[PDB]
Write a protein that binds this DNA or RNA. Structure first.
Lengths: 234, 147, 132, 103, 51, 128
RNA sequence: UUCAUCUAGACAGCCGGACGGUGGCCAUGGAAGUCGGAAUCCGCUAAGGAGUGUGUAACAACUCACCGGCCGAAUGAACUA
């Protein structure tokens, strides 16, 4: 549901992990407590992969992916590419992307159906995203920011956006993304909402300093909320 | 099975806060425990200390009050300190009060048990003016009639 | 607040004027200190790619000027040795300003960001466009 | 805080050793903020104009607005007032506490 | 949780001592003189403060 | 009003519902109970005075069904328990006291600390 | 150097007993001899405080007052250099 945990002592989970519908990715330098958050709740449905991208531990911001495909940047080595093609299932396709804009997570905000990309991305990538992910690509900015992946968490049900966002432009994106959108803060007043948390259909994991009113806004738009063991025995 | 003779102090209407910790390992209750205490303190004043004991097994209620201490001498009266200092007319009914009191007091009947409940009453006026120390030293009332 | 980072070549002493990569109104930053620096007689404490410096704004918005506030280096002109082998170096120096926790005040970063800064600081990699 | 004062000769003691004789309730607004523990860390000492106290009462009350906030987005102002305890003493110019240094 | 039969067993080794005023040494509670030489065998002893 | 639930942070398990909550709302504010008194070793001697906090930072609930194997097995007078899925210290049980942070007393106490737990409404969403 | 104790049994220690109204009463989340206020009674006793200290959340436990024997010639306090 709405579980909270943290990597080593940092609240942000979207930097250090990439959660999709059919798989999950985590960085290698984690404690036993951080790994046990995903293992206890995902179970054996989707494969959890320990990986690194380009010699880094920031794999949630370097990669871009959904149910059908994964996009990795150029500096990902052949040893790390061969490891991912084994642990992930045969349904997903992994493709290395030649970019000037290396960090694909900040650039691409995507789901099963509709993706928003950075406006200065080139045309040879727009052909590549739509054929790998199988997603319509729409060049658009969140009202004041070009980094659409960092400031806008998105799932299949809903999407949380940047707090300083006009209502007149949320109705533009909801017309475009075909999902309802709510603005808010995560991690006790951090405007970077896509890097603080992750989301798929059946799970959404955020930081430990996310307050209780903030957690209500998250699970509401994503619609992941829903007892005999509790009772009175005196 | 198992018997267990505990204790209970103070209270007028309901209380048992101190006892409440005693029922931790024992049978847990808040409703019937103050109700079984209410069956004990029924027609007993809430100002005065009511010392009792309760014996229980599988939520069993007990209400006994032996009153061999100052519980008797506070009962036969009219209700920085609420003064219990009264001129009590005890000496006639104190012959009846010592009769309930001296169940074993372990003395030679009433004549040596007419001084136990006298100085136990550490406040009252007794009969006439005073009824304490030298005012109840020599007992020439009832005495051997109770034996 | 600063985790483990492998030593790279020190290219920015006290008195350096590096650029300002973010969009918080400031134009350049003047380095006056390096957090966690050493101690040696007559030695200027020096910064590196990814260190945290105390810095003032010499040019930009007048609200940001005349106060000392911590900053994080994101580019460097002195060439450093990565462990995998290569010697690389950017074209100019750059820094972004931050709170002493390490969270960033600006919204985005223009220009590339060095990779050993994106691993060390979680907020800078969230706002980075291009990582090397 | 505590502020020293010449009862006879009307001077003010600065933290090290000074005895700046200032005009009463005109520019003592300016001589106090050196003695105060708080430095330039407080936002913008945007304004300072002290409010009236009784002239027989031995205390001085001041108001000020620091106005500079860094609560991650904005610069929201804040207004508050503090008080000062007047203490009288001797100031050896005005005390005559006399015998070698005659010069 | 501490079962105060065992708390009295441990306080004899920790709390029930005496402290010399000059050299701050830890002394037995029935002592009259401090056993060290760097305080000159002084006899100004105080009990150790209880918690 | 409506019934509410108290879900555990990092466990996401419903620890306690409403129809509970013996909230004891007023503190006393007087000098013997509303203030925190630290005496000395001897002679009833006050060394410290502490003012009580704003709101009672606990939830005093009835002993519930999931608490029962910790309360039957090794029954003691004081201790602590956890969520049944994360083993994190949520709240302690004590048959003595531990008034509130804000201070009264209670009864024999089953306190559920409101740090590292939170309270959500049991009904539908507010739909803001 | 000056006092004071002891074969008419000390000092030091060990062995027993220390009960009964009784968790006396107001006071309070709780106070049972021992956080505190004020009373100091009575039963039995060889002797035993409405308790001398240590302690417990509150008891308990133990120590002291007090009563007995067990032991066998030394012991305590101040001071001078």
């Amino acid at each position: 549901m709405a579980t909270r945990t943290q990597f080593e002592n940092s609240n942000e989970i979207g930097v250090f992990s990439k959660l999709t519908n059919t798989y999950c990715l985590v960085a290698v330098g984690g404690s036993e407590n951080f790994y046990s958050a995903f293992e206890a709740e995902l179970g054996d449905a989707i494969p959890i992969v320990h990986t690194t991208i380009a010699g880094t531990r920031i794999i949630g911001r370097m990669t871009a992916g959904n149910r059908r495909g994964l996009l990795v940047p150029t500096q990902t080595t052949d040893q790390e590419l061969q490891h991912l093609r084994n642990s992930l299932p045969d349904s997903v396709k992994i493709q290395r992307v030649e970019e000037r804009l290396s960090a694909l997570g900040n650039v691409i905000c995507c789901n099963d159906y509709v993706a928003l990309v950075h406006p200065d991305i080139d045309r040879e990538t727009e052909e590549l995203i739509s054929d790998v992910l199988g997603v319509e690509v729409f060049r658009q900015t969140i009202s004041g920011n070009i980094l659409v992946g960092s400031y806008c968490s998105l799932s299949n049900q809903g999407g949380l956006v940047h707090p300083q966002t006009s209502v007149q432009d949320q109705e533009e994106l909801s017309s475009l993304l075909q999902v309802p959108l709510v603005a808010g803060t995560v991690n006790r007043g951090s405007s970077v909402v896509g890097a603080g948390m992750v989301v798929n259909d059946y799970l959404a994991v955020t930081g430990l300093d996310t307050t209780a009113p903030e957690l209500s806004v998250i699970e509401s738009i994503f619609r992941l909320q829903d007892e005999s063991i509790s009772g009175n025995l005196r | 099975x198992x018997x267990x003779x505990x204790x209970x102090x103070x209270x007028x209407x309901x209380x048992x806060x101190x006892x409440x910790x005693x029922x931790x390992x024992x049978x847990x209750x808040x409703x019937x425990x103050x109700x079984x205490x209410x069956x004990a303190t029924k027609e007993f004043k809430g100002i005065k200390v009511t010392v009792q004991l309760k014996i229980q097994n599988r939520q069993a209620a007990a209400s006994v009050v032996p009153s061999a201490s100052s519980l008797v001498i506070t009962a036969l009266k009219e209700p920085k300190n609420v003064k219990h200092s009264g001129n009590i007319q005890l000496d006639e009914i104190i012959x009846x009060x010592x009769x309930x009191x001296x169940x074993x007091x372990x003395x030679x009947x009433x004549x040596x048990x007419x001084x136990x409940x006298x100085x136990x009453x550490x406040x009252x006026x007794x009969x006439x003016x005073x009824x304490x120390x030298x005012x109840x030293x020599x007992x020439x009332x009832x005495x051997x009639x109770x034996x | 607040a600063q985790g483990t980072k492998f030593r790279i070549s020190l290219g920015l002493p006290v008195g350096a004027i590096m650029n300002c990569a973010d969009n918080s109104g400031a134009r350049n930053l003047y380095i006056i200190a390096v957090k966690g620096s050493g101690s040696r007689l007559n030695r200027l404490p020096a910064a590196s790619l990814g260190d945290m410096v105390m810095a003032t704004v010499k040019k930009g918005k007048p609200e940001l000027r005349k106060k000392v506030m911590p900053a994080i280096v994101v580019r460097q002109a002195k060439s450093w040795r990565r462990r995998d082998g290569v010697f690389l170096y950017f074209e100019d120096n750059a820094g972004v300003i931050a709170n002493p926790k390490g969270e960033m005040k600006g919204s985005a970063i223009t220009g590339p960001v060095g990779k050993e800064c994106a691993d060390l600081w979680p907020r800078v990699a969230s706002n980075s466009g291009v990582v090397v | 805080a505590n502020i020293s004062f010449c009862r006879n000769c009307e001077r003010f003691l600065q933290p090290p050793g000074q005895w700046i004789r200032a005009e009463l309730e005109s520019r003592e607004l300016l001589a106090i903020c050196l003695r105060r523990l708080k430095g330039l860390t407080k936002v913008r000492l945007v304004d300072a104009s002290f409010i009236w106290t009784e002239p027989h009462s031995r205390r001085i009350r001041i108001k000020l607005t620091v106005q500079g906030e860094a609560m991650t987005n904005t610069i929201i102002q804040q207004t508050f007032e503090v008080e000062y305890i007047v203490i009288a003493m001797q100031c050896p110019d005005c005390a005559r506490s006399y015998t070698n240094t005659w010069r | 949780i501490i079962e105060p039969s065992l708390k009295a067993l441990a306080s004899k080794y920790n709390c029930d001592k005496s402290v010399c005023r000059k050299c701050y040494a830890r002394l037995p509670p029935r002592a009259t003189n401090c056993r060290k030489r760097k305080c000159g065998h002084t006899n100004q002893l105080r009990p150790k403060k209880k918690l | 009003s409506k019934v509410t639930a108290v879900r555990c942070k990092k466990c996401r398990t419903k620890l306690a519902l409403s129809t509970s909550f013996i909230a004891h709302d007023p503190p006393s504010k007087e000098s013997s109970e509303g203030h925190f008194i630290k005496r000395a070793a001897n002679s009833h001697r006050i060394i410290d005075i502490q003012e009580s906090q704003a709101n009672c930072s606990h939830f005093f609930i009835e002993p519930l069904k999931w608490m029962q194997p910790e309360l039957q097995g090794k029954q003691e007078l004081e201790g602590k328990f956890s969520c049944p899925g994360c083993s994190s210290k949520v709240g302690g049980y004590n048959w003595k006291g531990s008034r509130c942070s804000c201070g009264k007393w209670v009864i024999p106490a089953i306190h559920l600390q409101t740090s590292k737990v939170d309270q959500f409404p049991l009904q539908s969403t507010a739909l803001p």
